[PDB]
């Protein structure tokens, strides 16, 4: 249960700055840890500043990237489905009754199955 209006566009748009700032923060903490260890090995007791362990931040960056990726994949699936439905199915959404639509769908499925069986028999006879 998310209830995000199912619209991916503004979601991705509003989520982009999160990726930006998270990348900024991870680069910052990485540079901090770098200067810390470079003062550790040869410097002195100077790096006294408890920062993030760089594990949680990087991993949550990966996780938000993951969430945006799955959202974009869902958006692509939705648009592709809309496209092919528009391309190979008439517009009847309450001018044909739903039983007629279901019957047409079943008939098309049967014709596709017949085509598939014909091609399979052809491949069999070939071999």
């Amino acid at each position: 249960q998310q209830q995000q209006d199912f619209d991916p566009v503004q979601r991705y748009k509003m989520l982009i700055p999160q990726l930006k700032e998270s990348l900024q923060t991870l680069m910052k903490v990485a540079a901090q840890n770098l200067i810390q260890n470079t003062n550790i090995d040869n410097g002195q007791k100077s790096s006294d500043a408890p920062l993030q362990r760089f594990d949680k931040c990087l991993e949550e960056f990966y996780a938000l990237c993951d969430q945006l990726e799955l959202c974009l994949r869902l958006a692509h699936e939705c648009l592709s489905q809309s496209c092919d439905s528009a391309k190979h199915s008439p517009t009847l959404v309450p001018s044909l009754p739903y039983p007629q639509y279901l019957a047409v769908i079943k008939a098309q499925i049967t014709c596709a199955k017949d085509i598939h069986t014909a091609l399979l028999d052809c491949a069999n006879k070939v071999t």
Binding site: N42, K45, R53
Partner: protein, 240 residues
């Protein structure tokens, strides 16, 4: 014996040796129970814990995960380390590095999570298995089941120094002059080579100049032949 402390009734290392007579857990108790003040030597000690001493920490970690591997197709698996005496020596090392970290925050923690002092629980499990195996103890108690839990802190990919051999059994071994046919842990080991890297065959795999400023203790201590160090060899890096 690397302590420039103040004298007392007995030697510092000698008085530390008797730590065996102590309770099971809460090393933070026993450390002040024996002595706390006279253990610091100088400010310039922040080069051993975070660089080389971390090993021993990881070492004890490598024991835990390797504890429940008796069913593996190897009776001791990787290792067993059920001597106790050597284990007691390592436990003394743990308590002294604990008071070290108490004296300086650049110690070797678990590096992963649950810091708010994993080292304490690690040490208490080690002392538990120790006292469970000191004087002819059992192996795999019920405690073994609970300590077998994999805390989200154990790292991997340790050296475990080793070398090939000459398995010429009975008949013939023909080699060329080159192109062999098949058949010091102070860091200094990146992925690709970065210096001359004078190494050795026993376990060493170390650097030539040691690239340090005041850690000359180990370097000078191992300039000559190391543990059976007749195999101190050298080889340049590859080039494309």
């Amino acid at each position: 014996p690397h302590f420039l402390n103040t004298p007392d009734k007995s030697p510092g290392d000698r008085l530390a040796e008797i730590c065996a007579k102590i309770t099971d857990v809460d090393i933070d108790k026993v450390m002040i129970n024996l002595k706390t003040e006279e253990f610091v030597l100088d400010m310039n000690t922040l080069q051993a814990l975070q660089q080389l001493l971390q090993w021993v920490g990881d070492f004890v970690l490598y024991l835990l995960v390797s504890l429940p591997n008796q069913g593996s197709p190897l009776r001791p698996g990787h290792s067993f380390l059920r001597d106790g005496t050597s284990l007691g020596m390592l436990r003394e090392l743990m308590v002294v590095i604990r008071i070290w970290g108490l004296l300086k925050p650049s110690c070797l923690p678990v590096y992963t999570a649950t810091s708010d002092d994993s080292m304490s629980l690690l040490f208490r499990l080690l002392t538990k298995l120790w006292i469970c195996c000191r004087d002819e103890g059992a192996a795999s108690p019920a405690s073994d089941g609970l300590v077998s839990r994999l805390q989200p802190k154990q790292p991997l990919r340790l050296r475990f120094g080793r070398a090939p051999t000459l398995p010429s059994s009975t008949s013939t071994l023909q080699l060329d002059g080159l192109t062999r046919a098949p058949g010091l842990h102070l860091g200094a080991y990146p992925t690709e080579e970065c210096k001359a890297c004078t190494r050795c065959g026993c376990v060493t795999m170390l650097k030539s100049p040691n690239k340090t400023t005041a850690v000359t203790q180990w370097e000078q201590r191992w300039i000559k032949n190391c543990l059976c160090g007749g195999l101190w060899r050298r080889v340049p890096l590859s080039c494309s």
